[PDB]
Amino acid sequence: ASIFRCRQCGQTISRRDWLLPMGGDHEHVVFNPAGMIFRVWCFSLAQGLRLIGAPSGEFSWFKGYDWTIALCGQCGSHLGWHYEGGSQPQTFFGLIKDRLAEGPAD
Ligand SMILES: O=C1C[C@H](NC(=O)OCc2ccccc2)C(=O)N1
Ligand SMILES: [Zn+2]
Numbered sequence: 001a002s003i004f005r006c007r008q009c010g011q012t013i014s015r016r017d018w019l020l021p022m023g024g025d026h027e028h029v030v031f032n033p034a035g036m037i038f039r040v041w042c043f044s045l046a047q048g049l050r051l052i053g054a055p056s057g058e059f060s061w062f063k064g065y066d067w068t069i070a071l072c073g074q075c076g077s078h079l080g081w082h083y084e085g086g087s088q089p090q091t092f093f094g095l096i097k098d099r100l101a102e103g104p105a106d
Contacts, residue, residue, distance in 0.1 A: 004100040009075035014046040020092050030061045040094040048073050051082050
């Protein structure tokens, strides 16, 4: 089983087997209105995160879902976002691939 950890501190976050094909693919290369560019990978489940702020629909990369910022719960690195449906209760995470390290369970 392949595991995703926080690249900064090694906190365990998610699993390759939780990748989620939102819109057809887990990977979305996106930018926010301020011009920050991210390679986002969608996961159905994740742990080790602290969510901050209120949910927002602003410029959501996944139509019909609102986002909340997700930090590493250990080190405070910005690891991505939590998404929740605006009209149904599904949830998932969009995590910044380059802020994760993928490797074996060990
Ligand atoms: O789906 C989304 C999430 C994303 N939000 C965003 O970039 O908000 C600003 C921000 C929050 C925290 C760290 C960086 C930028 C956005 O514009 N669309
Ligand atoms: Zn961390």
